[PDB]
Design a protein around this ligand. Sequence first.
Ligand SMILES: [K+]
Ligand SMILES: [Mg+2]
Ligand SMILES: [Mg+2]
Ligand SMILES: [Mg+2]
Ligand SMILES: [Mg+2]
Ligand SMILES: [Mg+2]
Ligand SMILES: [Mg+2]
Ligand SMILES: [Mg+2]
Ligand SMILES: [Mg+2]
Ligand SMILES: [Mg+2]
Ligand SMILES: [Mg+2]
Ligand SMILES: [Mg+2]
Ligand SMILES: [Mg+2]
Ligand SMILES: [Mg+2]
Ligand SMILES: [Mg+2]
Ligand SMILES: [Mg+2]
Ligand SMILES: [Mg+2]
Ligand SMILES: [Mg+2]
Ligand SMILES: [Mg+2]
Ligand SMILES: [Mg+2]
Ligand SMILES: [Mg+2]
Ligand SMILES: [Mg+2]
Ligand SMILES: [Mg+2]
Ligand SMILES: [Mg+2]
Ligand SMILES: [Mg+2]
Ligand SMILES: [Mg+2]
Ligand SMILES: [Mg+2]
Ligand SMILES: [Mg+2]
Ligand SMILES: [Mg+2]
Ligand SMILES: [Mg+2]
Ligand SMILES: [Mg+2]
Ligand SMILES: [Mg+2]
Ligand SMILES: [Mg+2]
Ligand SMILES: [Mg+2]
Lengths: 99, 135, 86, 96, 97, 52
Amino acid sequence: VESFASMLRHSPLTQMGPAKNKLVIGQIFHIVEDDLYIDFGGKFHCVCKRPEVDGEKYQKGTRVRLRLLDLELTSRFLGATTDTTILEADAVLLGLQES
Amino acid sequence: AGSRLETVGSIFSRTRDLIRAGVLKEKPLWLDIYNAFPPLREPVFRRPRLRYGKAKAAVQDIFYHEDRIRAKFYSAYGSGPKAFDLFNPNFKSTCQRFVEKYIELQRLGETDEEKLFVEAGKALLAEGVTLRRVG
Amino acid sequence: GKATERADAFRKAKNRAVHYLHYIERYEDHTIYHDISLKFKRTHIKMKKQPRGYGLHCHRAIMTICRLIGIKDLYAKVSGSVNMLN
Amino acid sequence: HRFMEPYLFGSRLGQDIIDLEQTAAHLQLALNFTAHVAYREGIILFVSRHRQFAHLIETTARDCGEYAHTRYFKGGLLTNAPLLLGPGVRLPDLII
Amino acid sequence: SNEDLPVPMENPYKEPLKKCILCEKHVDYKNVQLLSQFISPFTGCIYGRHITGLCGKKQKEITKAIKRAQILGFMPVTYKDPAYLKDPKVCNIKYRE
Amino acid sequence: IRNYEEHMQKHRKDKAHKRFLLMSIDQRKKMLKNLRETNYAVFEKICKELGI
RNA sequence: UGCCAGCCACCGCGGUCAUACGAUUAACCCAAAUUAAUAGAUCCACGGCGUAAAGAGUGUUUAAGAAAAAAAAUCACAAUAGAGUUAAAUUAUAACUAAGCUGUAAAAAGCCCUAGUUAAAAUAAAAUAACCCACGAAAGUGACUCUAAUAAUCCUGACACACGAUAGCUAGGACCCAAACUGGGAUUAGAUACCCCACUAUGCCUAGCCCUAAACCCAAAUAGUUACAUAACAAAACUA
Ligand SMILES: [K+]
Ligand SMILES: [Mg+2]
Ligand SMILES: [Mg+2]
Ligand SMILES: [Mg+2]
Ligand SMILES: [Mg+2]
Ligand SMILES: [Mg+2]
Ligand SMILES: [Mg+2]
Ligand SMILES: [Mg+2]
Ligand SMILES: [Mg+2]
Ligand SMILES: [Mg+2]
Ligand SMILES: [Mg+2]
Ligand SMILES: [Mg+2]
Ligand SMILES: [Mg+2]
Ligand SMILES: [Mg+2]
Ligand SMILES: [Mg+2]
Ligand SMILES: [Mg+2]
Ligand SMILES: [Mg+2]
Ligand SMILES: [Mg+2]
Ligand SMILES: [Mg+2]
Ligand SMILES: [Mg+2]
Ligand SMILES: [Mg+2]
Ligand SMILES: [Mg+2]
Ligand SMILES: [Mg+2]
Ligand SMILES: [Mg+2]
Ligand SMILES: [Mg+2]
Ligand SMILES: [Mg+2]
Ligand SMILES: [Mg+2]
Ligand SMILES: [Mg+2]
Ligand SMILES: [Mg+2]
Ligand SMILES: [Mg+2]
Ligand SMILES: [Mg+2]
Ligand SMILES: [Mg+2]
Ligand SMILES: [Mg+2]
Ligand SMILES: [Mg+2]
């Protein structure tokens, strides 16, 4: 039986370090007319817009490349006891995954 | 009929007290399961007071000696050319490989950080990976 | 229970009373376990344990509650505001 | 939240990490408690006000044969049950 | 016996704090060019922190250095010296739209 | 205390320094009393030398 | 009987349908006593001081008292008192042009010794920096320069010592500008008010006095705790 502490040490999330400026691949699980809901393995799902080039091949289950900036968008405003989360993540599109 | 006070105590505490009192003559079915299997913490209502003064939280930061090595690699070479993949439980990142070879190299008895860092970079170059220095 | 008519006021209060029930522990079913001193809002009420012989020397509202609960030996002193609800 | 401090293994770069060892201990009792109340012919209600798994949770209860309520929760549902649902209504014996 | 537990160390990823434009530099009341870049060319007012961007230490020193030059006779008061009108722009305010 | 008195003789209308002069005298007066009740031999020498 | 005659220990009753006045029936409670009047027993705070009566305008010290575990001389910036200095505006004043100039929701009065432009002392006040929060015990201080300079090896403390915005008084000097009082215009039923124009005390410097403020952050000083726990409202609660 592997102790839980050992699992965190070798987990890919811990090996990433800071989430800012990290090249992480993700998979699309929901498609709107202009918004691509991408899951990159983090806690939440980042949202990006379809690029004007090769936009027809961004379908469900397609793998894309992301540049994570904040793992979870969250800020504190005055008069708020607890921070108001956005339940999303911030990322940008660098293209499609090169199979 | 029953008790509807949330702050008096747990659901178990009120139910067994009413039964012992003699008002609830029909024992609820979930009560027997509760006696045999109790939870870790009895559900007692408590007011979420806000922390004032010098008191802080007891949550510890998760830091490792590996993280100290990873900071130097990220500061110098930035993010590695390999793309991180979180879907693979057994994924081996370029930085993780750098740390693993750094640990093995320092087992030879080397103490200088500069020697450890440079040799690890040369050792990675022998494996074919790219380590284009930033700036 | 509050309503426009006094007769309807009594009916609402009785039915809503059985919904909120406490169980008060009674040492030997004649007294509280130990002396209790509390300050609810702006009402200071202090109660003391008593033996079997000397019973029910308390505020006239407390005596009514004590007879319903079952306590038969108690001493209570009320200080500050004497508002019935508090 | 202040009450979740004991259940937190630690914080990793501002991100809290939940101690799964305590999760396994709690989940073992939760599943064990859930089965027993189902064994005794108990009503189980799935409640989840989240608009991303509402359909999945609703379908999950249908397969198990139990009830689900992932829609808007009315004010006097569980408390004023006779008026909301019907004259004689059996209240759920467990809520998930 | 478990070596996998985290150690109580400081954060290794603490990026160095941002430096102001004039950090570690010596302001003076004799170099008009340095003092002139933080003055509105049309009116002669002194820009605040939200426009200059300097820290809390080099903002007061610039203010005191400028006002010393106003009275001692080293720079104009009601307008920016036209000789230094072509210096690189450091402020974040735009007049032309 | 001597420095404040020299300053006071020049700037007579200064009130911030006059308060400092009075408080400095009171503090020295308090400390002299404490010294007297502990070490009389040293207190006599200090009193004679400084002219207090 | 009809806010009349009268009643009450406190709250109150009576204004043509009073369980409160007066009488009657009935009832209640004490009883050889009952009721009224005045004294006395008893009764305030081991409670409170943001909003309620309550932290005194400030600091030091004397009398007095606390110490008991630990630990603690501060600090870029506008403290204060002297000496020197002036950028922007305004005015005396001169030249030139113009016949009007000031003023209001709208006008009148005032000015025409005026207005615009150019040149320019003295006095007074200190744009932007300041979306900064520093110095002093408080009241206070933010144009520039120099000199002097911000007690205590780091507890509490008065009726004692020292200080205390602004208005006001006494003597001398200054007077751009603002301006109680006063005069004129307008408004109004009246306007000894709001609005407009003129001008004085005075706001300023030197020396003395007065010692008052919503002197309010309505929250006393020194050490601490976030435990217990929501009257209301406000700036969360509490211990020595
Ligand atoms: K000025
Ligand atoms: Mg009362
Ligand atoms: Mg009578
Ligand atoms: Mg009659
Ligand atoms: Mg009567
Ligand atoms: Mg009568
Ligand atoms: Mg008061
Ligand atoms: Mg008060
Ligand atoms: Mg006082
Ligand atoms: Mg005092
Ligand atoms: Mg003494
Ligand atoms: Mg002076
Ligand atoms: Mg006229
Ligand atoms: Mg003129
Ligand atoms: Mg003159
Ligand atoms: Mg200020
Ligand atoms: Mg002090
Ligand atoms: Mg000091
Ligand atoms: Mg003292
Ligand atoms: Mg005065
Ligand atoms: Mg005055
Ligand atoms: Mg005066
Ligand atoms: Mg007089
Ligand atoms: Mg005079
Ligand atoms: Mg005058
Ligand atoms: Mg005038
Ligand atoms: Mg008049
Ligand atoms: Mg004040
Ligand atoms: Mg006061
Ligand atoms: Mg005070
Ligand atoms: Mg005091
Ligand atoms: Mg002190
Ligand atoms: Mg304190
Ligand atoms: Mg309320």
